[PDB]
């Protein structure tokens, strides 16, 4: 069985989305530079350590899906300068997203999260994303273009023994799910900064951590059309932080109005025919 296609972020940029469209998955080598990975890790480190279990009793929106050996930290903009500046303005991410979502219109971040898997974390069951937040997605026609995609960025090494992600190639086009098995999977072996890109229909899972010593970390960036509601809110992010961002980054975090691809688009999150950014007089690129 054939492996996940590997593509250069520098050279093969126009080939990335067509590849995912065909196979359901692609590995983007050096999606983030090692410098960006280093700064991202440093900035999120303490927030990963203080994060409780996903289904902690203190939470009013507990995650009952993820294992107790998973830690997930979202709403990264206020935590990480590298995220809000480098990741949110990634030329590669934006080319892929505009290739992917042009049929629908504008796109934004549905969730940007760091996930850290403790030693001996078991494999996740094979799944498609979005089913515990957006039931609407299951009612889309089979040939509907993907309404969200997920960049699974390695922040530490992904190996077969430490739980590298499994994917079933071609499974984004499957309607009958009788042949879903771990026998049908291939692995996303990745160095830090490489990204596995999948769609919301790609059948995949986190792998089993089998060493008992290694901690695997990733940055998962679910990008989706602006017509779908994000899993996370940036409503509580301080205005100085928001005003430090580019207009594009502001749009990605829901601090701007949005547009569909309809020829006479009437817009999303508008205020009596005017945008959020015009109405609130929202500055951009103001240093902290």
Ligand X SMILES: O=C(O)CCC(=O)C(=O)O
Ligand Y SMILES: O=C1N[C@@H](Cc2ccccc2)C(=O)Nc2ccccc21
Residues that bind ligand X (CB under 6 A): 124, 129, 152, 165, 204, 206, 218
Q: Which residue stretch of 11-19, 98-106, 120-128, 191-199 sits at the interface with a second copy (rule: CB under 8 A)? A: 98-106
**After what residues is the chain interrupted, C–N > 2.5 A?**
none
Q: Which residue stretch of 10-18, 172-180, 198-206, 251-259 sits at the interface with a second copy (rule: CB under 8 A)? A: 251-259
Q: Which is nearer to ligand Y, 274 or 286 (CB)?
A: 274
Q: For residues 231 and 130, what is the distance between their CA atoms, to the nearest angstrom? A: 9
CA 148 to chain centre: 9
Q: Which of 34, 91, 83, 45 is nearest to 245 (CA)?
A: 83
Q: Confirm or deny that 106 is annotated as ligand binding.
A: no
Residue with token string 């771990």:
182
CB 73 within 8 A of CB 79: yes
Pairing between β-strand 186-187 and β-strand 216-225 as defined by DSSP bridges: unpaired
Q: Confirm or deny that 127 is annotated as ligand binding.
A: yes
82 Cβ partners below 8 Å, 6+ apart? 36, 39, 40, 43
For residue 182, the minimal CB distance to ligand Y (Å) is 14
For residue 245, the minimal CB distance to a second copy (Å) is 15
For residue 218, the minimal CB distance to ligand X (Å) is 6
Q: Compute how many other C-beta atoms are within 10 angstroms of the C-beta atom of residue 144.
A: 12
For residue 131, the minimal CB distance to ligand Y (Å) is 6
User: Quick check: 51 binds a second copy (CB under 8 A)?
Assistant: yes
Binding residue positions for Fe cation: 127, 129, 204
Q: Which residues are annotated as a binding site?
A: 127, 129, 204
Residue ranges binding a second copy (CB under 8 A)? 51-52, 54, 56, 59-65, 73-75, 103-105, 131-136, 139-141, 144-145, 147, 225-233, 235-236, 255, 257-262, 264-276, 278-280
């Amino acid at each position: 069985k054939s492996q996940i296609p590997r593509l250069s972020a520098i050279n093969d940029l126009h080939k990335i989305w067509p590849t995912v469209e065909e196979h359901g998955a692609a590995i983007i080598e050096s999606f983030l530079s090692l410098d960006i990975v280093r700064r991202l890790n440093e900035e999120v480190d303490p927030f990963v350590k203080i994060e409780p279990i996903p289904a902690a009793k203190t939470k009013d929106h507990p995650n009952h899906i993820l294992s107790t050996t998973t830690r997930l930290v979202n709403v990264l903009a206020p935590i990480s300068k590298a995220y809000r500046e480098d990741v949110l303005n990634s030329k590669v991410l934006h080319r892929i997203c505009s290739d992917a979502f042009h049929v629908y219109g504008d796109y934004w971040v549905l969730m940007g999260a760091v996930m850290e898997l403790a030693p001996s974390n078991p494999a996740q069951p094979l799944h498609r994303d979005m089913r515990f937040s957006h039931p609407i997605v299951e009612y889309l026609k089979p040939d509907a273009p993907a309404t969200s995609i997920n960049f699974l960025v390695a922040l530490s090494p992904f190996t077969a023994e430490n739980g590298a992600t499994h994917v079933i190639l071609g499974s984004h086009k499957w309607q009958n799910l009788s042949n879903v098995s771990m026998d049908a999977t291939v692995r996303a072996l990745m160095n830090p900064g490489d990204a596995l890109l999948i769609t919301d229909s790609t059948i995949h899972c986190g792998g089993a951590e089998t060493t008992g010593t290694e901690t695997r970390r990733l940055l998962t960036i679910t990008m989706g059309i602006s017509q779908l509601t994000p899993l996370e809110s940036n409503l509580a992010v301080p205005r100085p932080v928001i005003e430090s961002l580019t207009p594009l980054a502001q749009r990605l975090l829901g601090w701007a109005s949005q547009r569909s691809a309809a020829p006479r688009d009437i817009g999303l999150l508008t205020i009596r025919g005017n945008s959020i950014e015009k109405t609130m007089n929202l500055k951009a690129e103001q240093p902290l």
